[PDB]
Amino acid sequence: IKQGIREVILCKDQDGKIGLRLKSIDNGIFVQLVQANSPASLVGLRFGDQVLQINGENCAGWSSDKAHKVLKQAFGEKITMTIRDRPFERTITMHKDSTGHVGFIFKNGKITSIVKDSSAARNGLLTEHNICEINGQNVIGLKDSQIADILSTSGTVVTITIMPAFIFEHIIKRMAPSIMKSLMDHTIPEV
Numbered sequence: 001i002k003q004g005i006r007e008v009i010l011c012k013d014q015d016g017k018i019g020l021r022l023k024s025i026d027n028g029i030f031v032q033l034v035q036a037n038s039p040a041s042l043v044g045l046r047f048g049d050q051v052l053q054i055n056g057e058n059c060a061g062w063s064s065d066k067a068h069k070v071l072k073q074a075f076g077e078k079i080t081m082t083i084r085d086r087p088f089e090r091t092i093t094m095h096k097d098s099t100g101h102v103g104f105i106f107k108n109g110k111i112t113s114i115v116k117d118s119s120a121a122r123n124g125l126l127t128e129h130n131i132c133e134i135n136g137q138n139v140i141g142l143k144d145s146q147i148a149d150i151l152s153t154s155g156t157v158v159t160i161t162i163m164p165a166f167i168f169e170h171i172i173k174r175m176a177p178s179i180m181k182s183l184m185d186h187t188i189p190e191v
């Protein structure tokens with residue numbers, strides 16, 4: 001999680017889409033969805049990113065509706081955004097033991113127990129936290145089985161990016177569970 005603000009320059013695709021849904025939280029605007037193969041994914045926007053400015057207008061106080069309207073009404077040859085990097089999230093680094101375990105249990109992407117004497121206990125992993133990313137890959141809307149698969153196939157170093165469940169549950173409200181599964185960019189980014 002970068003400790004600062006960054007500018008991204010965006011470009012509506014042939015269909016006038018950028019591949020983004022935005023959400024009002026605590027009078028800010030946050031990324032709810034980044035669509036696979038979109039302008040939003042190619043510039044590196046991420047779930048949980050805060051949008052500070054669009055085209056140098058401040059977002060503070062906007063409804064989700066107004067942010068979506070502003071995006072639509074933009075002469076989008078070049079859209080600038082000022083982004084604060086996933087402010088509600090933290091990254092934890094853990095090491096599999098020789099049985100291949102980092103040492104927790106999750107349900108619906110939510111960590112529910114930490115196993116004593118584990119890398120997850122040693123690194124202070126918390127329960128009541130949703131898994132946003134593993135090893136730089138967005139996992140939101142994957143089945144629990146597919147998240148366990150990704151951990152299985154990871155090298156011994158496992159990076160997990162987590163969010164307080166209450167904040168997570170507030171961000172994904174009014175987004176159907178199959179849009180998250182179908183359309184949320186789960187890919188490794190392109191270079």
Ligand SMILES: CN(C)S(=O)(=O)N1CCOCC1
Nearest residue numbers: 105106107143144145146148
């Ligand atoms: C209970 N399931 C959906 S599971 O067996 O597929 N499971 C494996 C262990 O981590 C959590 C997910």
